[PDB]
């Protein structure tokens, strides 16, 4: 940005150095004010003009604005090219780049609307008369009765208003802190709840009277690949628009306006659409027979600029056939309003406002007008059937009208069309001749420019023989001729045509994100039947034998959108908690897997991408804990559920739990007992595939139909007793019958396309756009995942050894609770300190804290800030002195039973409590006459054989420990320290016979090793039990740990 500043300085020097000194003293404080105002007026698209300005300096200002505009535009495009390819950048760069490209798109839209106002309507009158009379003939062929205006009391207005207000309040239920303009909207919605009939009167008055509307705001959703607009509407108009949306869909569903080929429907998720499309391709009359030169053609395409090229007057003329005319005038009047972005106002006159409530109707009706242009009236009448007996989706009247025409399968998702043709030899030759008559090809150039699917192998995708390529070009030409280019436009570069012939053994398409390859049984090898996931087995309806296979993959745009979502998650700041990142990863991973259920297993690049993104997410937390890279890191830090203090991260990968990390220990009155309890369970095994889901769905709904038919005749109401065999099963879920809002949700028609079009109204992204829980039910279960996750990590006692739990002295876990969704970083680090601060995690570098015996592996400031707070004010030395004084008061009483003549407390040096190179004795006992000593043995060892080495002096030393997950065995530690400190030239002990008592604070363990005179060992066992139960300094340490961890009971 410094080069632009040097350029501005050079421009100002070239301006000021020409004028003399009496004008240098004036124009240094004259030009600089409006110099920024001219650039501001350019950026706000305001025409810059000021009187009293000379013309060469005005041309200099215009050259300055033009040069900075070119620099700014190329900088914005280069910044978008940096973040599109995946290069890392600061978040403020993307936040400014979104505004720059928002202003550029607004300048483009304001230009193209004025170009439409200047050049006139781009549609001719004859094409308008053609589509108008076509719609008239179609609606008179079906006897469609128009949608009436709701007069005074339709007796369903209350339920529709309730549904509209629920869909309006569905967005604001995420966060509990809102803005004032949002509080005003919630207040208006609550006032609409309080008085429904006044709200209905306001809606009907705005319908019959109002034609002017407040300005609609625009924002852009920041996808890394493609910008998408979100519109903001005034709430008083928004309530009326939502009620109009509900009433139009509920009337159009009853009047049967939409033919069954128009998709999405309310009864199918899009993978069921793909499955039924594959079954419809399979079940045709002799579809794979190519012995006489027949061909199959699969066209898929998209209507380019369908949303921007709708003329509003033509829309009103086509809309007045189906509703009341005031309703059509209200639907046209909302589209002609001023769009604002923060400085920029422009009116809308061409193209619809896609972010409206009722706009979900407008796209679905207008695109119906496209079906009369593409499919033809005769073939649409043969597909839909009579009005008194309509056909099903991908079904015909008879077989003769099925095979009477080549255009024999048709489907339209919102703007993507999928057509399937069956040609003979002579029809294909005639179509290729009709193509080559107008478009000759002397050099065979129609191979270059052919869109093909590179994700498949070379023998698996389309083989480009010349006849099949010419047939595909002819098919796309014949479809493109039927559409007037002023109304809609299809393009070859955005389309795809697959051909199945003698030279092409398999058929390809892309639909609903799925890459599908269909391959017949009779075009391949023998029976072998090795079962694979992502392989659908296709069978006939009549003979029920196998005919073909369907191979599923995930397309490239879904994987790129997922990788952009991972890059959005990795844009979290340093103050962001770890749990928010893990929750975003879990939401994204469920939104990937539960939609692409059976096809993730078949594609290998997505399985590599999931593991790569998961390791980047774990590395984001690894760098956040410590700056230095760890050599190892336990997965039980991550995959522990949030109830036990972990993160609850979902798994897609091959992670093996290492041995000797499933061990745990427990100390009781008989001593220290050890116990020993593998792969982390994956997500894809806990989700049902789509094929078994559809077969089981059909089976359970057939059984419900038979049980309902039996229950009607017996005067019996079905209860939970008869449907407890098939709970959770089928789609929609049987669970949706047993719900409180049956009469409320039964009036909601067309909910799936509305849920899909919520993306132009809400600023946040929407995973699970393809479903709604109140209508489908719940389509996955993850309690088994958490159960197997707790079971796979070695149990709760196996997890809690990593978690500093035994430093808190709670007897159980079940009565405990956390102080309140999210856990902070300090509490997480102090909780998982025994498994992070280990020797085999940060290799080599270790230090010691000053006033404690805590060994810090590496350096962790986020744990140091807690270990200073816990162990402040010499608590280590106070605990040591308290244990020494309590044991001295133990040895003070019961004097004659052990023949003790003098107990002596040694002068303890104030650094002795935490130095670990050497030690010294703490409590010295003098024998009255003589004491028999035993061999050096453990505290719990009872096989003691005493020697004749009678000694008088006895010494007792107290040692403290702060261990970790692998080194916390206090018995071998006390034995090693005894054998070290009794066999060295630096430690000082006045007696060769003694004992060392070791206490580990991080797990609260205690043991002893050394010599034993008679009567000393049960006394020391009971004394140390009494101390570990009743030391007040240990109680201060425990209450400080429980205060730091925020863990209560």
């Amino acid at each position: 940005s410094h080069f632009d500043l040097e350029l501005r300085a050079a421009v100002m020097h070239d301006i000021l150095d020409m004028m003399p000194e009496g004008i240098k003293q004036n124009k240094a404080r004259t030009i600089l004010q409006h110099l920024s105002e001219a650039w501001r007026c350019w950026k706000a698209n305001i025409p810059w003009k000021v009187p009293g300005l000379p013309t060469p300096i005005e041309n200099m200002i215009l050259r300055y604005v033009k040069a900075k505009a070119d620099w700014w535009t190329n900088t914005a495009h280069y910044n978008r090219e940096r973040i599109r390819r995946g290069a890392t950048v600061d978040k403020t760069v993307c936040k400014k780049n979104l505004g720059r490209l928002t202003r550029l798109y607004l300048k483009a839209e304001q230009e193209r609307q004025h170009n439409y106002l200047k050049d006139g309507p781009y549609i001719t009158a004859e094409e308008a008369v053609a589509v108008y009379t076509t719609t008239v003939h179609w609606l008179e062929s079906r006897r469609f009765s128009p949608i009436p205006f709701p007069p005074l009391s339709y007796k369903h207005d209350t339920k529709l208003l309730i549904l509209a207000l629920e869909r309006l309040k569905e967005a604001y239920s995420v966060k509990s802190r809102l803005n004032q303009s949002q509080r005003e909207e919630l207040g208006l919605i609550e006032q609409a709840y309080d008085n429904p009939h006044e709200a209905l009167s306001r809606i009907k008055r705005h319908l019959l009277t109002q034609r002017a509307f407040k300005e609609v705001g625009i924002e852009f959703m920041d996808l890394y690949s493609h910008l998408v607009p979100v519109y903001d509407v005034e709430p008083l108009e928004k309530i009326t628009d939502a009620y109009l949306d509900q009433y139009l869909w509920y009337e159009a569903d009853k009047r049967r306006l939409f033919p069954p080929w128009i998709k999405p429907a309310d009864t199918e998720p899009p993978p069921l659409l793909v499955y039924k499309w594959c079954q419809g391709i399979n079940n045709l009359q002799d579809v794979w027979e190519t012995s006489e030169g027949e061909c199959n053609v699969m066209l898929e395409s998209r209507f380019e600029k369908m949303y921007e090229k709708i003329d509003l007057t033509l829309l009103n003329r086509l809309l007045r056939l189906i509703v009341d005319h005031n309703i059509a005038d209200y639907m046209t009047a909302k589209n002609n309003v001023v769009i604002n972005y923060k400085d920029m106002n422009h009116t809308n006159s061409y193209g619809i406002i896609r972010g409206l409530q009722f706009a979900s109707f407008i796209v679905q009706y207008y695109g119906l007008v496209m079906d009369l242009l593409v499919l033809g009236l005769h073939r649409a009448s043969e597909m839909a059937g009579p009005p008194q007996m309509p056909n099903d989706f991908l079904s015909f009247q008879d077989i003769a009208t099925e095979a009477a025409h080549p255009i024999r399968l048709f489907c339209r998702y919102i703007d993507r069309i999928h057509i399937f043709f069956r040609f003979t030899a002579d029809e294909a030759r005639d179509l290729i001749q009709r193509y080559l008559t107008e478009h000759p090809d002397p050099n065979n150039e129609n191979i270059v420019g052919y869109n093909n699917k590179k994700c498949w192998p070379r023998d698996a995708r389309m083989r480009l023989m010349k006849h099949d390529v010419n047939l595909g070009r002819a098919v796309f030409w014949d479809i493109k001729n039927r559409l007037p280019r002023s109304v809609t436009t299809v393009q070859w570069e955005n389309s795809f045509v697959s051909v199945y012939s003698k030279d092409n053994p398999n058929l390809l398409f892309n639909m609903c994100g799925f890459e599908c390859r269909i391959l017949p049984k009779c075009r391949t090898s023998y029976e072998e039947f090795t079962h694979k996931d992502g392989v659908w087995n296709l069978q006939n309806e009549v003979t029920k034998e196998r005919t073909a296979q369907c191979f599923l993959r995930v397309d490239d745009e879904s994987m790129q959108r997922f990788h952009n979502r991972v890059r959005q998650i990795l844009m979290a700041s340093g103050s962001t908690t770890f749990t928010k990142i893990v929750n975003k990863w879990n939401t994204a991973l469920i939104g990937l897997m539960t939609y692409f259920r059976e096809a993730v297993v078949n594609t290998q690049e997505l399985l590599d991408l999931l593991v790569k993104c998961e390791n980047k997410i774990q590395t984001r937390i690894k760098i956040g804990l410590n700056s230095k890279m760890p050599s190892r890191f336990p997965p039980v830090v991550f995959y522990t559920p949030k109830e036990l203090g972990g993160l609850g991260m979902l798994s897609m990968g091959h992670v093996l739990i290492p041995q000797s990390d499933l061990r745990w220990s427990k100390q009781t009155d008989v001593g220290i007992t050890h116990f020993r309890s593998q792969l982390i369970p994956n997500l894809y095994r806990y989700i049902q595939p789509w094929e078994s889901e559809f077969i089981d769905s059909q089976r359970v709904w057939a059984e419900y139909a038979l049980k309902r038919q039996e229950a009607i005749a017996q005067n019996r109401r079905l209860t939970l007793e008869d449907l407890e065999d098939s709970w959770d099963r089928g789609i929609p879920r049987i669970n949706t019958l047993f719900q409180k809002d049956r009469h409320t949700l039964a009036y909601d028609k067309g909910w799936r396309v509305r849920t899909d079009f919520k993306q132009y109204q809400v600023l946040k992204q929407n995973p699970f756009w393809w479903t709604h829980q109140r209508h489908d039910g719940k389509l996955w279960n993850l309690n088994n995942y958490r159960t197997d996750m707790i079971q796979a990590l070695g149990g709760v006692e196996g997890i809690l050894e990593h978690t500093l739990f035994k430093g808190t002295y709670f007897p159980t876990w079940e009565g405990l609770f956390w102080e309140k969704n999210q856990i902070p970083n300090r509490r997480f680090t102090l909780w998982w300190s025994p498994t992070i601060n280990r020797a085999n995690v940060y290799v080599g570098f270790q230090v010691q804290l000053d006033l404690t015996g805590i060994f810090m592996h590496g350096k962790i400031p986020t744990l140091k800030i807690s270990l200073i707070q816990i162990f402040r004010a010499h608590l280590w030395q106070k605990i040591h002195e308290s244990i020494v004084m309590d044991l001295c008061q133990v040895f003070d009483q019961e004097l004659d039973a052990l023949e003790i003549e003098t107990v002596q407390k040694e002068t303890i040096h104030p650094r002795k409590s935490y130095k670990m190179n050497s030690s010294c004795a703490d409590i010295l006992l003098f024998a009255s006459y003589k004491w028999n000593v035993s061999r050096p043995s453990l505290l719990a060892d009872s096989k003691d054989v005493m020697d004749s080495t009678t000694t008088q002096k006895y010494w007792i030393d107290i040692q403290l420990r702060w261990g970790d997950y692998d080194s916390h065995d206090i018995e071998r530690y006390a034995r090693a320290k005894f054998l070290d400190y009794t066999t060295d030239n630096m430690s000082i002990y006045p007696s060769p016979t003694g004992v060392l008592i070791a206490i580990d604070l991080a797990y609260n363990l205690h043991s002893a090793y050394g010599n034993w005179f008679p009567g000393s060992k049960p006394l020391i066992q009971q004394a140390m039990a009494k101390i570990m139960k009743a030391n007040p300094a240990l109680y201060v340490l425990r209450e400080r740990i429980r205060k730091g961890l925020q863990l209560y009971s």
Binding site: L607, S631, R632, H654, N682, S692, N784
Partner: peptide, 28 residues
């Protein structure tokens, strides 16, 4: 075993997709 999540390519031989997936009982 230094962390290092691995890919599932080739590491599924006897594991299907629908296996070990259970459904809930009706509540009360």
């Amino acid at each position: 075993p230094t962390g290092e999540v691995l890919s599932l390519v080739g590491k599924l031989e006897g594991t299907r997709m629908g296996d070990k997936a259970q459904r809930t009982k009706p509540q009360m």
